[PDB]
Symmetry: C3
Subunit: 97 residues, 3 copies
Amino acid sequence: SGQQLEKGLSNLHRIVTEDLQALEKSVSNLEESLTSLSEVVLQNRRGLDLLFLKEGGLCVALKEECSFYVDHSGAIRDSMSKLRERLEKRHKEKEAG
Amino acid sequence: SGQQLEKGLSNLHRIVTEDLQALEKSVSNLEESLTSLSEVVLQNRRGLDLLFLKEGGLCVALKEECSFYVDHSGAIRDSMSKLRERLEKRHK
Amino acid sequence: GQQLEKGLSNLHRIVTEDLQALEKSVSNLEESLTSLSEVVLQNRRGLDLLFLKEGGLCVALKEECSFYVDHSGAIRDSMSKLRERLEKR
Ligand SMILES: [Cl-]
């Protein structure tokens, strides 16, 4: 029935939106955590550079190529903020369905 | 075509479910890795506080405000556990 | 319900857009996290050097060593196959 199918479509939309919201929220929590941890790590490394000051710093002291952090904070937060906008609007829309 | 639309709804449901499960598994893997890394980092920091014991610890020695780790593990694990339950219970 | 076909393809399109945003973000998180783990293990090699005669960092602390749990390969493959499906779609 057409009205039956309308309700199934609305119901599918409602439940997929809820699952996408759970993922957006979790991805944004991971970004916040990971960025905060990167600040802890680079502060730890500033401490190591001071302890190794005589030897030219941590990476020189170890005689190794210096590893560096790859920061995607801006891109993830922009992407997830636009996703939140879409999901929140779709969520209020389907409260009527 | 009403019958075909019904199969269409079910087909879309199946396909989205498989993609949501892929993201759920990867989010959960990322959370396990990130949480394990935070314990490594904090252990490294305890070692640095030992090395800077006479200067009052790492952050005093550097004359900086201490950076703070923001932990969301419980919230991420609960969000994803509930999402796995909904995905599984609707699987028909 | 007369435009159900348009509603269904619309839903498919919207969800595809949202899954693509989540895939890109998960994959960026994976690259950042893996890079941070390399910085952190290099930091710990420095600490093990400073504590060499004590037997390294975790012995000097009198603690069991914490270790990094790596899922890079699994995440990358999962997200590669997802991108493969989403672009086909
Ligand atoms: Cl560290």
